[PDB]
């Protein structure tokens, strides 16, 4: 679990969106595993607008932050699950690091701000949905 709170927006993993997120829907994309909903209160977070490939992410299954080297946003194959058919997820960045299913929503940050959120993983791998290209989040 976890979300990004910026301005009057809440950014969450689309597969973890609540009834309230869908009732206050701004934008959603199954191919990116992202959903953005509107809020009444002003958010706490700021978004990075950079090309950083190193950062730090929060891992809930270890209650710890870890440093990572991550790949550029790209189209990566993701196995079928209860949430989605087998498909290519776009704007996904991979890194070597620990992750379990419940880790989705953990924030990845660089020196400039929020980069994205945990969205996939495997045996010693962790994948993040990029949000740096969503310029409308703060303007
Ligand atoms: C941090 S997630 C994770 C980590 C380790 C291991 Br094994 C497995 C996962 C779970 C995972 O990759 N997905 C894919 C995700 C998606 N974006 O399609 C939807 C939830 C779930 C099925
Ligand atoms: Zn950066």
Swiss-Prot record:
Q: Which residues form the signal peptide?
A: none
State which residue ranges cross the membrane: none
Tell me which residues bind Zn(2+) 1. Answer: 50, 52, 110, 112
Q: So what does this thing catalyse?
A: Selective cleavage of Tyr-|-Gly bond in the picornavirus polyprotein
Residues annotated as catalytic: 15, 33, 104
Tell me, in a sentence or two, what this protein's role is.
Answer: Cysteine protease that cleaves viral polyprotein and specific host proteins. It is responsible for the autocatalytic cleavage between the P1 and P2 regions, which is the first cleavage occurring in the polyprotein. Also cleaves the host translation initiation factor EIF4G1, in order to shut down the capped cellular mRNA translation. Inhibits the host nucleus-cytoplasm protein and RNA trafficking by cleaving host members of the nuclear pores. Counteracts stress granule formation probably by antagonizing its assembly or promoting its dissassembly.
Q: How does it assemble?
A: Homodimer.
Q: What name does the UniProt record give this protein?
A: Protease 2A
Source species of the chain? Coxsackievirus A16 (strain G-10)
């Amino acid at each position: 679990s976890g979300a990004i709170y910026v301005g009057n927006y809440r950014v969450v993993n689309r597969h973890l969106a609540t009834h309230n997120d869908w009732a206050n829907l701004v934008w959603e994309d199954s191919s990116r595993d992202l959903l953005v909903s509107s809020t009444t209160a002003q958010g706490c977070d700021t978004i990075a607008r950079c090309d950083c490939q190193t950062g730090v992410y929060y891992c809930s299954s270890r209650r710890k932050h870890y440093p990572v080297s991550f790949s550029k946003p790209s189209l990566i194959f993701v196995e079928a699950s209860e949430y989605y058919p087998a498909r290519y997820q776009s704007h996904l960045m991979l890194a070597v690091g620990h992750s379990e299913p419940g880790d989705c929503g953990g924030i990845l940050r660089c020196q400039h701000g929020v980069v994205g959120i945990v969205s996939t993983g495997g045996n010693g791998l962790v994948g993040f949905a990029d949000v740096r290209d969503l310029l409308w989040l703060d303007e």
